[PDB]
Design a binder for this molecule. Structure first.
Ligand code: OGA
Ligand code: MG
Ligand code: NI
Ligand code: ZN
Length: 331
């Protein structure tokens, strides 16, 4: 088996290899990339997502989210307080303010230490889940707004036609902005392009050891766990590398920089944080290998996780038994 230790692999495709998205994904998986739950793809030096980012201030962040933490430094939940709309310009200015800016630090490692030590005592503001794209339409390779859709994949593989669409989202981050421990909706893949700004650090549990993470989470958030059989779908829980190491949870970490893609793989739990002002674009996608993961994916039926229009049809076709009870949580 390739990559038996489930290490995060880093790919350096040539521009020739960068033309066929699906085939390169299959290539990475032939080399065992998926076992880690996360891979890094450095685009060819000739490739550009767009000409410049000169004009992005005028994007509106309709509902910025203030990420308020509770608990201890290594084990905390966050809640998202809705704030008033602001432009990307205003957000960038806020990110650079003294209150919110990245502190002085020696290197990524020192910054990571400060993140995990000090996260809970601050409440950064995240512009997350903004429908849109920053890829130039003339970018033909690895354009997150022009991927084949999950609905089209489901149709090619299983012959069924469903409603739904699948479009990218932008994320505007600042120092300490956090994405909690999760897998994708329906345990899909995700792909994330860091367009500009400061880095994003990622942590990931190998898909084959996902249940160990879940087991630890039930022990760390025992009431959340009683309330919902798939409470990690709420995307609120954080567990530090230290606490994962202490409980024998296998994981890896890696830092994504501006200009780099990350792909999460089916059932690869991930979490992370931003080093400073940045902008990422991400979208879910599927492959033939996804289909069984989609059939086995846990669902939030407590009603917190409250997910997309398009997810209805995935659950209805792949999880027809769950479909009656799941939609009661989604209605
Ligand atoms: O970038 C973020 O804040 C969160 N992104 C993801 O969880 C992802 O791309 O799968
Ligand atoms: Mg603009
Ligand atoms: Ni994700
Ligand atoms: Zn729930």
């Amino acid at each position: 088996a390739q990559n038996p230790n489930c290490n995060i692999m880093i790919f350096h495709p040539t521009k020739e290899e960068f033309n066929d998205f699906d085939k390169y994904i299959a290539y990475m998986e032939s080399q065992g990339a998926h076992r880690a739950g996360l891979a890094k793809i450095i685009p060819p030096k000739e490739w550009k997502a767009r000409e410049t980012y000169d004009n992005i201030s005028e994007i509106l962040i309709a509902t910025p989210l203030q990420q308020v933490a509770s608990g201890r430094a290594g084990v905390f939940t966050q809640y998202h307080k809705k704030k008033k709309a602001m432009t990307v310009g205003e957000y960038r200015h806020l990110a650079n303010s003294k209150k919110y800016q990245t502190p002085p630090h020696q290197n990524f490692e020192d910054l990571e230490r400060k993140y995990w030590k000090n996260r809970i005592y601050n409440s950064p503001i995240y512009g997350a889940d903004i429908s849109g794209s920053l890829f130039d339409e003339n970018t033909k390779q690895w354009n997150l707004g022009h991927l084949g859709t999950i609905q089209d994949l489901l149709e090619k593989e299983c012959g069924v036609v469903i409603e739904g669409v699948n479009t990218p989202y932008l994320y505007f981050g600042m120092w300490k902005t956090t994405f909690a421990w999760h897998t994708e909706d329906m345990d899909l893949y995700s792909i994330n392009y860091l367009h500009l700004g400061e880095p994003k650090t990622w942590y990931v549990v190998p898909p084959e050891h996902g249940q160990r993470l879940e087991r630890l989470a039930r022990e760390l958030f025992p009431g959340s766990s009683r309330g919902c059989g798939a409470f990690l779908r709420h995307k609120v829980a954080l567990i530090s590398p230290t606490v994962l190491k202490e409980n024998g949870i296998p994981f890896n970490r890696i830092t994504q920089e501006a200009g780099e893609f990350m792909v999460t793989f089916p059932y690869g739990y991930h979490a992370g944080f931003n080093h400073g002002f940045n902008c990422a674009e991400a979208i879910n996608f599927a492959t033939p290998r996804w289909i069984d993961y989609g059939k086995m994916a846990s669902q939030c039926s407590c009603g917190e996780a409250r997910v997309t229009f398009s997810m209805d049809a995935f659950v209805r076709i792949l999880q027809p038994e769950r479909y009656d009870l799941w939609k009661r949580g989604q209605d």
